[PDB]
Design a binder for this molecule. Structure first.
Ligand SMILES: CN[C@@H]1[C@@H](O)[C@@H](O[C@@H]2[C@@H](O)[C@H](O[C@H]3O[C@H]([C@@H](C)O)[C@@H](O)[C@H](O)[C@H]3N)[C@@H](N)C[C@H]2N)OC[C@]1(C)O
Lengths: 171, 185, 60, 51, 230, 159
RNA sequence: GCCUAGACCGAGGACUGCGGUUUUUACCUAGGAUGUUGGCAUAAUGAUCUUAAGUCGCCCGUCUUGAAACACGGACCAAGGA
RNA sequence: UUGCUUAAUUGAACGUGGACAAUUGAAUGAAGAGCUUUUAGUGGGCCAUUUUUGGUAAGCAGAACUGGCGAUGCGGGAUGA
RNA sequence: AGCGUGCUACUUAUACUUCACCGUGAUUGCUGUUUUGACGCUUUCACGAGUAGGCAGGCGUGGAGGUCAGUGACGAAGCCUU
């Protein structure tokens, strides 16, 4: 809900040399369309020697999840910048949408590597379709036969300040 | 707050009333304020602002300047209007028949106007016989002829008169005014 | 003992923009002081002759 | 002496905009649009999903 | 005498106003038709763009909207500690207080002007209803250097009627469709004096909308901000 | 001690261009200057006579006087809170015509011609220039131009 | 488009305007609050002084880039004082 | 027109007469524009971002542009030019 | 109730919005109704930090010309006093 996946399609402005410049597409994870077009131009100015002023955005479209109530495992490839250098890394997430997995990834890199949103490039997000593709044991352990587990030590949230009965944590 | 684009609370910088306490000048201001408010003839508004002017801004108008104005092509019959004093001029060879409306006439100026069969009238009489300033010709005296104006903006190579009490060879004609005494400015 | 500030232009543009910065006024006719003396001399005669010719043709 | 908001005051709304009567009478604010059912993206535009 | 004298005056008014209303009914029919015609062309412009976007998908093409021609610019920074060049630009945009707003016609010249004022303003592209609401609630005219409420069509016709603007809907149409007399209509409007947003800004304002602040071009979310502040 | 002589600070400004030393091409001497012409001032370091002061190097002004080998040029100089009108005598080696003015006179001629064409046709044309407007709507075909997807690339070192 | 819960305000003082409804030289919500009821006038009400509580509040004058200053003058009061 | 200039009937500068009108030749703004006189205080500064010199460095010393404090309270930074 | 990051609501400046009142600047109109204040009355809009310093409008004291045929031993002036 923090993010949406967009396609952004753009091209160079037509000139006399090139009447039909080549259309390019990027898949962008952004809070809204303004940021989506900003990110598109950011990556186009890195990858190619183009500017925003000599180009134009052709289309911006939400890409909805195909199966929003199917449980999936995603692999995400990332380029991020640390305090010290620049690194590549690959992590796995379980979710029902690509946007949910991307949001969890942003939280996770903020938590473990102190990587802010500006420091991260999303190389690729892929639904892992075979259980053999799942490489990380922190997600693999939820892919075993007849998984069941309790939730020991339940803490009930109280509306009142003072309770007349002793606490329990059974569940 | 405000990022002001001009100075706040600035007065108009124009006089809106006579500084004078002469009651009859106030009567004239009253008449011409009515006239400027109810008539939209440009002449009445000009006359109203003129009644506010200070003495140095109402230089005297001589009868010779009036006669030169009356010699303009088509102006021999106009009513000459002076918001100020009309003075005599003994350099004048002849003066024509004319109607002059002024605040004040010196005795010589009035005798010369009346002797040549003209009319010397005040500004209220003018308002009665020309409420829109029809066939009038406003004449103003020379403002910059004042002796004080000679000393304004004095400085090197400016050509203005020094502020000096005595005049002679010993009074500010040496160094600074002569190449034989250093330099000349 | 008397060491102090030597120079700064701090606050100087701020003072200059309170009433400035005003361009000099432009006029239709410039002053010919400082123009080549031979040109200026003959220009005197050219203007004088033009007035005399206009004063003539207007009579007829 | 007192400014009245036409979006609140119905009379002032009519004073400034006589058409506001017809807009309400014709239900312009909730007008049905007549059209058929088409899916113009059922072909190549489905490169929105994957390349 | 006085009750009689005032009754005799009342009759002369009552008959004279009877003539005026008949003359005003022919003019009110004129501005009624203009408003109805403006509505029709707003509806046809929306539907035509929708049809074009649909037809482009079917024909394996991409429709590209016309670029916006209009922005609404709101100053959201106070009046202290502004460098001279953006200070002058904000003055030239008639944005001399906080929460002041003006309409601007987009060109290269005005785009570079707004570029200079970017860390001090929030702007974007106003919808028709946003423009209508701004003009109806906080619309004021500059009549002889005075801020005069636009409470009657006479006030608009007296000042802009020479540019064929006879009503508040004519003015709204001229603003929304960046029309031939946009300069005169936009300058006749006093800068809009908005409130702070009900609901506040984001946590920190003075950074671009893209980086999570409130300044810069937010491009359609200017309408939500105006609903908050208007 | 400090040094504030007439040509102080002009080490590079008054140098000749690389491989552009030596004799002045004669086109410099064949140009005709008239009172009212607009000229750019550029000091030539090989002509020590009639040189501009370094202040006027790169300034543009009006011609006000024409003598045997030089022109008089009017320059406005900010002095305190106002401009002072300066009059500088410059030999023609240090002077050149300004090109923007020739462009503007061309536009004057074109405006007159277009107005006359419209007046003969019976209509009115617009002569004011316009700034670049936002682009209008358009349709882009994908024939042989299917949108091609790009992604950010992984980091690599090449040392 | 519709329904619904609260708060603050009531400037102005014959009429005059713009609109609306028209069933009308009429009426209106349309150029700024009126209607009604109870209580009180041996008073409900308002101001000041004293004091309590809450919250904030360094000693003035001065020279100074910078004073509450561990910078200087000032115990207090009258009259005089540039 | 001229006493300047050309081999000149060529030019130069300033003109008479004729024509071209609200798109009079980009944008935005304009509590309007121009002009004058007269006189006070001040002529120890200091701070911040950025550029920058001497110095190991300094809450050190010296410059650049802008904003400030001084001359200014108010909300926040407990406290603080 | 720590660190990184996202979200929802909420708190309150002499700031912003609407309204009241004071002042300043501008502004509308005012003579067969101008009416003994036209230095007046009236319509409307905007604005309000300030040392050194400038200017304006006022308050207060001794004495002088004019006026109130002013107050006063039936109590002037002074002084004390929720
Ligand atoms: C790319 N060139 C940059 C130039 O743009 C500029 O960068 C500033 C940077 O220095 C500012 O940062 C500066 O100011 C902040 C704060 C007081 O504002 C300080 O916290 C910071 O330490 C200080 N370096 C930063 N806030 C904006 C950049 N444009 O100055 C530094 C630089 C390297 O020359």
């Amino acid at each position: 809900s923090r993010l949406n996946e967009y396609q952004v399609i753009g091209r160079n402005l037509p000139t006399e040399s090139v009447p039909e410049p080549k259309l390019f597409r990027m898949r962008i994870f952004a809070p809204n369309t303004v940021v989506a077009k900003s990110r598109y131009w950011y990556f186009l100015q890195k990858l190619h020697k183009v500017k925003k002023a000599s180009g134009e955005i052709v289309s911006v479209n939400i890409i909805s999840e195909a199966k929003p109530t199917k449980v999936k495992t995603f692999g995400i490839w990332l380029r991020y910048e640390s305090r010290s250098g620049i690194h590549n890394m690959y992590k796995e997430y379980r979710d029902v949408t690509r946007v949910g997995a991307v949001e969890t990834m942003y939280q996770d890199l903020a938590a473990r590597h102190r990587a802010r949103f500006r420091s991260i490039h999303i190389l690729k997000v892929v639904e892992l379709e075979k259980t053999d593709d799942v490489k990380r044991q922190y997600v693999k352990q939820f892919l075993t036969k007849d998984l069941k587990f309790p939730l020991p030590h339940r803490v009930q949230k109280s509306k009142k300040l003072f309770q007349a009965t002793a606490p329990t944590t059974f569940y | 707050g405000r990022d002001h684009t001009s100075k706040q609370h600035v007065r108009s910088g124009h006089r809106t009333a006579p500084k004078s306490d002469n009651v009859y000048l106030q009567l004239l201001v009253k008449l011409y304020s009515f006239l400027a408010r109810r008539t939209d003839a440009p002449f009445n508004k000009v006359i109203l602002k003129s009644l506010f002017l200070s003495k140095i801004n109402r230089p005297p108008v001589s009868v010779s300047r009036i006669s030169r104005a009356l010699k303009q092509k088509g102006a021999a019959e106009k009513t000459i209007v002076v918001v100020g004093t009309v003075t005599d001029d003994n350099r004048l060879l002849e003066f024509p028949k004319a109607t002059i409306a002024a605040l004040r006439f010196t005795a010589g100026a009035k005798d010369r106007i009346l002797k040549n069969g003209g009319e010397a009238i005040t500004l209220d009489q003018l308002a009665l016989r020309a409420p829109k300033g029809q066939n009038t010709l406003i004449v103003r005296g020379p403002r910059n002829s004042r002796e004080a104006v000679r000393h304004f903006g004095f400085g090197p190579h400016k050509g203005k008169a020094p502020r000096i009490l005595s005049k002679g060879r010993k009074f500010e004609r040496a160094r600074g005014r002569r190449r034989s005494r250093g330099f000349k400015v | 003992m008397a060491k102090s500030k030597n120079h700064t232009a701090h606050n100087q543009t701020r003072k200059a923009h309170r009433n400035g910065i005003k361009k000099p006024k432009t006029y239709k006719y410039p002053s010919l002081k400082g123009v080549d003396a031979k040109f200026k001399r003959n220009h005197r005669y050219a203007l004088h002759g033009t007035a005399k010719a206009l004063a003539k043709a207007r009579a007829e | 002496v007192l400014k009245k908001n036409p979006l609140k005051n119905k009379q002032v709304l009519l004073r400034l905009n006589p058409y506001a009567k017809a807009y309400a009478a014709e239900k312009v604010g909730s007008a049905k649009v007549e059209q058929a059912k088409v899916k113009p993206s059922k072909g190549q535009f489905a490169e929105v999903l994957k390349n | 005498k006085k009750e009689k004298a005032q009754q005799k005056t009342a009759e002369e008014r009552a008959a004279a106003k009877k003539v005026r209303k008949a003359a005003n009914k022919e003019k009110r029919k004129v501005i009624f038709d203009r408003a109805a015609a403006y509505q029709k062309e707003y509806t046809e412009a929306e539907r035509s763009v929708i049809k074009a976007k649909r037809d482009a998908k079917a024909s394996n093409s991409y429709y590209v909207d016309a670029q916006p021609k209009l922005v609404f610019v709101v100053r959201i920074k106070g009046i202290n500690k502004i460098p001279p060049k953006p200070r002058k630009v904000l003055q030239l945009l008639r944005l001399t207080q906080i929460n002041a707003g003006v309409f601007v016609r987009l060109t290269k010249a005005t785009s570079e002007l707004i570029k200079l004022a970017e860390p001090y303003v929030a702007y974007g592209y106003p919808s028709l209803s946003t423009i209508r609401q701004l003009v109806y609630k906080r619309g004021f005219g500059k009549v002889n250097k005075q801020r005069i409420a636009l409470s009657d069509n006479a006030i608009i016709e007296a000042n802009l009627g020479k540019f064929n603007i006879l009503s508040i809907e004519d003015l709204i149409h001229e603003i929304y469709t960046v029309g031939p007399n946009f300069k005169q209509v936009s300058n006749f409007l006093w800068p809009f004096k908005l409130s702070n947003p009900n609901g506040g800004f984001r946590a920190r304002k003075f950074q671009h909308f893209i980086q999570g602040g409130d300044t810069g071009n937010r491009e359609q979310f200017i309408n939500a901000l105006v609903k908050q502040m208007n | 001690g400090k040094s504030r002589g007439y040509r102080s600070g002009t080490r590079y400004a008054f140098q000749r261009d690389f491989k552009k030393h030596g004799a002045i091409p004669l086109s410099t001497y064949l140009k005709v200057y008239k009172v009212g012409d607009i000229v750019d001032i550029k000091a030539n370091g090989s002509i020590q006579k009639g040189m501009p002061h370094k202040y006027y190097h790169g300034k543009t002004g009006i011609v006000y006087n024409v003598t045997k080998s030089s022109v008089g040029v009017i320059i406005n100089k900010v002095v305190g809170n106002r401009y002072i009108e300066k009059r500088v005598n410059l030999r023609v080696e240090h002077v050149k015509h300004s090109a923007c003015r020739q462009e503007f006179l061309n536009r004057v001629k074109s405006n007159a011609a277009k107005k006359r064409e419209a007046k003969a046709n019976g209509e009115t044309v617009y002569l004011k220039r316009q700034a670049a407007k936002p682009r209008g709507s358009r349709i882009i075909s994908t024939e042989g131009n299917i949108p091609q997807t790009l992604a950010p690339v992984a980091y690599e070192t090449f040392i």
